[PDB]
Design a protein around this ligand. Sequence first.
Ligand SMILES: Cc1cc2c(cc1C)N(C[C@H](O)[C@H](O)[C@H](O)COP(=O)(O)O)c1[nH]c(=O)[nH]c(=O)c1N2
Ligand SMILES: Cc1cc2c(cc1C)N(C[C@H](O)[C@H](O)[C@H](O)COP(=O)(O)O)c1[nH]c(=O)[nH]c(=O)c1N2
Ligand SMILES: O=C(O)/C=C/C(=O)O
Ligand SMILES: O=C(O)/C=C/C(=O)O
Lengths: 312, 312
Amino acid sequence: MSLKVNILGHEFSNPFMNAAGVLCTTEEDLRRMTESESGSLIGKSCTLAPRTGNPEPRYFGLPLGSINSMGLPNLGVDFYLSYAAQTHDYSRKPLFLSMSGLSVEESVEMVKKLVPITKEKGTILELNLSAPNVPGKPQVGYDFDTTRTYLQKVSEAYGLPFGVKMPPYFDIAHFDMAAAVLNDFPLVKFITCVNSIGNGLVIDPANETVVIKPKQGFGGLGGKYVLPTALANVNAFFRRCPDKLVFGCGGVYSGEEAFLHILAGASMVQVGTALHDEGPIIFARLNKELQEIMTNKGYKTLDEFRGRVKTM
Amino acid sequence: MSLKVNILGHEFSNPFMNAAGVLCTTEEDLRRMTESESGSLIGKSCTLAPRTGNPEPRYFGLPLGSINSMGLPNLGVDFYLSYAAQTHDYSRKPLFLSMSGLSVEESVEMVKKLVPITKEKGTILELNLSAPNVPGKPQVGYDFDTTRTYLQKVSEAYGLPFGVKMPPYFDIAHFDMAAAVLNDFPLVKFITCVNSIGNGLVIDPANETVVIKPKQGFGGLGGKYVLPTALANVNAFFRRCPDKLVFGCGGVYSGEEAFLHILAGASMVQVGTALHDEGPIIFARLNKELQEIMTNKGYKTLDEFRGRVKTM
Ligand SMILES: Cc1cc2c(cc1C)N(C[C@H](O)[C@H](O)[C@H](O)COP(=O)(O)O)c1[nH]c(=O)[nH]c(=O)c1N2
Ligand SMILES: Cc1cc2c(cc1C)N(C[C@H](O)[C@H](O)[C@H](O)COP(=O)(O)O)c1[nH]c(=O)[nH]c(=O)c1N2
Ligand SMILES: O=C(O)/C=C/C(=O)O
Ligand SMILES: O=C(O)/C=C/C(=O)O
């Protein structure tokens, strides 16, 4: 029995890691992720300068998942670059950093700074193209022209293998266009599907009031709301981008959901809402439950079923 | 106490109607809708010529709602025109008809046929710009240039007040862009938010197979998955298109969800997945549950709280 994933030169113990934005903003956070049973971890989506984010309340836990408008609260690119350079124990597990400049200029400047650390330490870049909670800033991934610009300029400035955290798409034509852009950039070695289902509204019937303060209650949705969306996106990019990996993200609460992600095509499986609720101890549970399903089915490795979902 | 609604020069006994596609394809379906306590009803999204739709299985009930790839099964526009002009009992309730031409040309031809019957009978048109289950046809509402063309040609052809069935949006810039196009068409008097969350994917862990045959498992999501997206879309168009009505659609199982939709701005509330599961008795239950909530809050009319959602 093995949960191991061997990708991009690294041996991951299992396919699990935090989703960008959950338990990865502060040094304490990253330490707790490093000490967890997770296969990897990813730093909070950072900007050039620090950000404090949106006003409170900006996170509300729901029966079926979560709503948030965090606003990219981060300690600044320099803090995360220092975590990657000086602090992080790589013998424990590989490290990803999420970078989320609020313009292409910004992202280009941050990405250059990672090149030397990537080269010395092996730190992996995930470019955030799905920031849904910044007032006045659109999700880049729903504009295929802008996406192209970002991938072009980041490819040039970084010049090493990276991946892209995509917004969820809801239309076949969009899968086609998205894939057409991505496939023109060979340095894009992995696609993380998906980010929050953007700009949901949750209202409390009791007090007739929204549950979050920013943007009139409008926040990205995670948790059980997102699983079918996540699987669809994972599979669609799995098929259309065979030269690339796909990382699954959305609605993972257990091994069963992790199994479906991998079955859909996922190499690594990211956990957000559920990790927020349960804490990094969830990864111990996920490993055992995923081992359980594989044992019951007679799968010895993830490679036996990765992307082997059956159609009718 | 009163659940009455006055809009488009018509009186409705209550805000509840079926969602296009649910209990509305056959004459039996529409009689059953007419005989229910629903305030209105809408005919299945029709085409010029009849369709039988996608192969089976094409629907699957889920704990949190539904996935479907029906493929616009419909008896043809002449059948629904005939139902509107000859069969339908307008003393019971007003009738909507959903037209869903798969091209501009087909829609122009169809709406032109509706004009005489709208004039003589009061039949209201809902233009479907969110058909996510017809292979090789994108959802029009995600292409603002195409959307513009439809509203242009339908406006000049039909030349009477009508509504649009929009796909869900998940990005602020898209709300703005959608609203900007819609606000250039004065004959668009109501926006139905929202259609299925499109191109989701359900996999059965047990047999490692998708649950619907068409499009490799990819189908539209309804029910509990959709509520937060539904409300956000309702409220976003309520604010951005103040010279239009918003019809609420998505995640309505009970009086509470109906109350949230109306609070967020909805004039009428359409019911899909839950009506499909429970049958037309649901409208009696919804009428009484909405009144129960209103009784508990001291509301006498829908206009005491319609559009009065509180922000922080
Ligand atoms: C509190 C919080 C914070 C963030 C997020 C989510 C949540 C809940 N998300 C989105 C997240 O990474 C993930 O895509 C979704 O949460 C969906 O996964 P789950 O269904 O929650 O497991 C997010 N994504 C990203 O790329 N960068 C980020 O900084 C954040 N921040
Ligand atoms: C079986 C079935 C059939 C259809 C649909 C759905 C389902 C479940 N839907 C979408 C429907 O009108 C509605 O927008 C969504 O189902 C969301 O509402 P619920 O959460 O299901 O109440 C749909 N919409 C539309 O505009 N025309 C149609 O013909 C259909 N057909
Ligand atoms: O920090 C946030 O508000 C979310 C970021 C994301 O969804 O990418
Ligand atoms: O008939 C269907 O397949 C779906 C219709 C609706 O989503 O427009």
